[PDB]
Amino acid sequence: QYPIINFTTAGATVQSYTNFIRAVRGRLTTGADVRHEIPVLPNRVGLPINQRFILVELSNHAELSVTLALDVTNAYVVGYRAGNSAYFFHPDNQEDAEAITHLFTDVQNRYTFAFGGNYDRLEQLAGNLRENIELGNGPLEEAISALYYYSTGGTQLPTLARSFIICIQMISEAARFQYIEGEMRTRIRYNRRSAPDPSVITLENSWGRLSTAIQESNQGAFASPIQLQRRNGSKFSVYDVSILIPIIALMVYRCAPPP
Numbered sequence: 001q002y003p004i005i006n007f008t009t010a011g012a013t014v015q016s017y018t019n020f021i022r023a024v025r026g027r028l029t030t031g032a033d034v035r036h037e038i039p040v041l042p043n044r045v046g047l048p049i050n051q052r053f054i055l056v057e058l059s060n061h062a063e064l065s066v067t068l069a070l071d072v073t074n075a076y077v078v079g080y081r082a083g084n085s086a087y088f089f090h091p092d093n094q095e096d097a098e099a100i101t102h103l104f105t106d107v108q109n110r111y112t113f114a115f116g117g118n119y120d121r122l123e124q125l126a127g128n129l130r131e132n133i134e135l136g137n138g139p140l141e142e143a144i145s146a147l148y149y150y151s152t153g154g155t156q157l158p159t160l161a162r163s164f165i166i167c168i169q170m171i172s173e174a175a176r177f178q179y180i181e182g183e184m185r186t187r188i189r190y191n192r193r194s195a196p197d198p199s200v201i202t203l204e205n206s207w208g209r210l211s212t213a214i215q216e217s218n219q220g221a222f223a224s225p226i227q228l229q230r231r232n233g234s235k236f237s238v239y240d241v242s243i244l245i246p247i248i249a250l251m252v253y254r255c256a257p258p259p
Contacts, residue, residue, distance in 0.1 A: 001050060002053045002054060002055050002069075002103075003027045003054050003055065004054075004055045004056075004057055004067075005020065005023045005024050005027060005054065005055070005056050005057070006020075006057045006059070007020040007056065007057070007058055007059070008058070008059040008060065008061075009058070009059070009060045009061060009137050009140050009141040009144065010059065010060055010061040010141075011061075012137050012188055013188065014185045014188055014189050017184065017185060017188050018181075018185065021171075021174050021175055021181050024054070024056065024070075024075075024171065024175045025039075025175055025249060025250060027054045027072075028041060028054065028070070028072050028075055028175060028250060029041060029042075029250060030042065033253070033257070035214065035215060035251070035257055036214060036217075036220050036241040036242075036245070037245050038214065038241070038244070038245065038248055038249075038250070038251055039249070039250050039251070040211075040215070040250070040251045040252075040253050041072060041073055041074060041075065041250055041251065041252055041253055042072050042073055042253065043073070043253040044073040044253070047072075047073065049099060049102055051072065052071065052072060052073075052099055052102070053069050053070065053071060053072060053078075053099075053102070053103060054069075054070050054072060055067050055068070055069055055070075056068040056069075056070060056171055058140075058144050058167070059144070060140075060141045060144040060145060061141060062141070062144070062145050064144055064145055064148040065082075065144075065148070066080050066081065066082045066144055066147045066148055067080060067081040067082075067104075068080050068167060068171065069081075069088075069100075069103045069104070070171075070172065071099075073252070073253065074252050075172040075175050075176055075250065076117070076172065077089075077117065077164065077167060077168050077171070077172055078091075078096075078100055078103070078117070079100060079103065079104075080147055081104045081107055082147055082148045082149075082150065082151060083148075083151070084107065084108040084109055084151070085107065085108065085109040085110075085111065085150075085151040086103070086104040086107040086109070086110050086111065087111045087112075087113060087150070088100050088103075088110075088111070088112045088113065089112075089113055089115070089116055089117030090112060090113055090114055090115055090116045090117075091112070092116070097112075100112075109151070117164070119165065119168075119204075122161045122164050122165050122168075123161075123165070124161075125157055125158060125160075125161035126158050126159075126161035126162040126165060127158050128158075128162065130165060130169070130195070130196060130201055130204070131195055131196065131198075131201060132195055133162055133165050133166065133195055133196075134193040134194055134195050135166060135169055135170060135184065135187060135193065135194065135195065135196055136184075136187035136188065136191070136192065136193035136194065137187065137188050137191060137193075138191070138193045139166045139170075139193055140166055140167070140170050142163070142166075143162075143163035143164075143166040143167055146159050146160060146162075146163040147160070147163055147164075147167070169196065169200075169204070170184055173200075173203075173204050175249065175250060176207055176248065176249060176250050177203050177204075177207075177247060177248055177249060178246060178247060178248070178249045179199070179200075179203060179246075179247045179248075180200055180203060180204070181249070183196070183197075183200055197231045197233075198229035198230070198231065198232075198233045199228070199229055199230055199231045201229070202227075202228045202229040203228065203247070203248075206226060206228060207248075207251075207252065208252060208254075209226055210226060210238070210244065210248060210251070211251035211252045211253075211254050212254040212255070213226055213238075214241045214244065214248075214251060215251065215254045215255045215257070216254070216255055217240075217241055220240050220241040220242060221239070221240055222238065222239050222240060222241075225237045225238060225239050226238040
């Protein structure tokens with residue numbers, strides 16, 4: 001009963017990717033929570049299990065499909081299904097462990113990885129940092145194949161980890177940040193793969209802090225500035241929500257909105 005959004009790398013265009021990310025955002029957020037023009041994801045607290053997840057079905061030119069499961073509270077990729085097998089990252093707590101039992105319930109083989117799904121752990125396993133992992137339609141095409149072939153032993157663990165890193169940034173991070181979506185649109189428009197620059201990396205790393213700063217702000221004004229980086233690595237100071245309206249598409253729930 002969880003909603004499914006389809007995307008294929010096969011003949012992907014700027015428009016088809018834009019449609020996809022728009023659809024993902026639409027299934028992640030209700031209209032219930034919008035602050036300083038920026039939507040907030042559902043609060044985890046009291047969220048019914050039947051509303052907890054969305055499914056992203058990825059297809060490629062190789063005629064292979066995988067289904068990613070995303071947690072609506074944070075857009076986090078919690079696991080995936082390929083054919084007869086499902087794989088889940090090590091859950092943070094008992095609540096999350098119970099929650100994932102509601103996913104891919106008719107799958108023949110269920111596995112939980114002994115490792116968590118955060119970038120730190122995935123980069124360790126991949127043997128490469130995000131700054132050195134190329135993104136684009138080509139990488140995503142290849143990532144879908146790598147995820148598909150894992151269960152049969154065709155995909156090594158570093159390649160699997162790399163492939164998760166690709167999927168997470170091109171789907172979850174693009175959903176969170178219009179800026180990151182824009183960066184992916186550009187890669188697709190010119191069919192040119194490239195690793196994410198410091199502006200992308202620092203946004204990814206700052207999503208929680210940015211969400212909290214916006215939600216705890218005084219009429220939009222931050223108590224403490226947040227430092228980001230430009231494409232060339234130079235520092236950019238954020239003092240206010242206003243500058244982030246074109247940049248951030250969705251926030252994680254951090255506090256209640258003030259009256």
